[PDB]
Ligand binder design. Structure first.
Ligand SMILES: Cc1ccc(S[C@@H]2O[C@H](CO)[C@H](O)[C@H](n3cc(-c4ccc(F)cc4)nn3)[C@H]2O)cc1
Ligand SMILES: [Cl-]
Length: 138
């Protein structure tokens, strides 16, 4: 397994048609996972499954600019399960990140950070065993 937290460089940032694939297994009794697509210190797209927020499971997405989190976008469809293998696919489209989990569409997140070629890191964190993290063009 890869070390977590994991830093995947995205050379020259992201671009529409770029597909990022994360494979891993959720730990037993997991509490949280995060993907952080970063522009320097800013977080263009934070994708954060929370397994126990007031005894509910929710995915929280947001952007961090100059160290400040913005308006959250929340999704109660929650495709992860403790102890189970998953695939997250993040497809960069012209106007949003499109996320599918286990080949099922989950959510879109409109681009708030607009210099896509400066979003040149993906951080992967939390309660997973990380099998692989990679990108390809479709
Ligand atoms: C004014 C105010 C007060 C509190 C908060 S809470 C905040 O909410 C954000 C989304 O809006 C992010 O989720 C953020 N966060 C989570 C993680 C994380 C790191 C490793 C990991 F495995 C899972 C998750 N890193 N940063 C969380 O601290 C927000 C605003
Ligand atoms: Cl969290």
């Amino acid at each position: 397994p890869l070390i977590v937290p994991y830093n995947l460089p995205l050379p020259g940032g992201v671009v529409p048609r770029m597909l990022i694939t994360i494979l891993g297994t959720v730990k037993p009794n997991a509490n949280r996972i995060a993907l952080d697509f970063q522009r320097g210190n800013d977080v263009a797209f934070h994708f954060n499954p929370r397994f126990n927020e007031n005894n509910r499971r929710v995915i929280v997405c947001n952007t961090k600019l100059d160290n400040n989190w913005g308006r959250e976008e929340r999704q109660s469809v929650f495709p992860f399960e403790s102890g189970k293998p998953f695939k997250i696919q993040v497809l960069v489209e012209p106007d949003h990140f499109k996320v599918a989990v286990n080949d099922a569409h989950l959510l879109q997140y409109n681009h708030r950070v607009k210099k896509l070629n400066e979003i040149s890191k993906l951080g992967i964190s939390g309660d997973i065993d990380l099998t692989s993290a990679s990108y390809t063009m479709i």
